Amino acid sequence: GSTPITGPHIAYTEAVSDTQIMLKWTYIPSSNNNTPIQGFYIYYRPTDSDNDSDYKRDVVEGSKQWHMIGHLQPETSYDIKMQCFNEGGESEFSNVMICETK
């Protein structure tokens, strides 16, 4: 199971509430020679921070193509990006989305 190289592409991010943001991505398994994917890592940080160590991480199963980030702060902008992974390692990051809770 070669480590993934190419990451997912986040198609959209949209607030669902004052504490939750939905993201949906596309990941084409052929992009990494159909290496098995254990899951995705979804990273989010308040947009007011430019410290790349300040991202929090959610772990999602490898079959999902969307996720709802929760426990966020109201009326707050987040930077959101993601990787895919397997036992070999992690991909490069996706595009970086900016999205505010309600």
Next chain:
Amino acid sequence: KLVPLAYKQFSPNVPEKTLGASGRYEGKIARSSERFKELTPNYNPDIIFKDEENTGADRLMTQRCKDRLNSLAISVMNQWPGVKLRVTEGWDEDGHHSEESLHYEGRAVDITTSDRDRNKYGLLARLAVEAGFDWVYYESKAHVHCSVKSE
């Protein structure tokens, strides 16, 4: 003479893509496209670029945008000692902006002050109008959106 904009106000108070403001969308500029060459990176030390992308995309903009942004950098520093202009988005290839966003052709910036003081943003927006941006929009409590006409 400087009157802050209110939250959600835009100036001039007409649609962004009208003639009197920033004018029409001319098409997305992608990194590999022939049109990518008309963007150049702004490396002004007076400006902080968020660059959460870690690509330098935020620095890329048209000449008209760079000129207006550099003027605004000055007026921010003059207004508030020790505060600088910060750009969260310049040219964009991530794709989270409106359809046909001027960000996609390097004609728009989203900005804050360096101290992220939300109550500076109305005045920051007025400074951007005075700096000559063709449309300025207090779009979010979190940032101001400013754009320019095509070259």
